[PDB]
Symmetry: D2
Amino acid sequence: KKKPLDGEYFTLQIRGRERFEMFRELNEALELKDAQAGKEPG
Amino acid sequence: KKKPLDGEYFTLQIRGRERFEMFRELNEALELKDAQAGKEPG
Amino acid sequence: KKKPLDGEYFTLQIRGRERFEMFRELNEALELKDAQAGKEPG
Amino acid sequence: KKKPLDGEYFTLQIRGRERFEMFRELNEALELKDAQAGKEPG
């Protein structure tokens, strides 16, 4: 499965329910760019 | 100690070491504003 | 060109050069998700 | 007034009204920490 041995994984506590969803959203956003970032050019 | 019974607490996994510190920074930023937000006016 | 009449556009001043690039990065991240968000399912 | 000659100022266009307010919020958050960051210790 390509192994999850990418960068070290971490965690962060976020108080607030609505605010939490907001942080997670930014995280998935960067992960999405990384998907097209490692996309071979051409 | 005013009890930690504020909003429900949550957590988020952030891959990458440098990126992790970045997310945590934004979290502490909002928490700082909340400190002066609950500061009685006058 | 599909017209740029989407949501109203706005602007934000960000002091600091390194910090500025950081904000712009988050903006492009959300815009990327929106691209796959409006992607017809199936 | 201490002169606004701090780091170079910049700008960023953010589509969406609700989203715009969100970005501006993060900006003010970092600026708040900077205020207590330049606060002489002791």
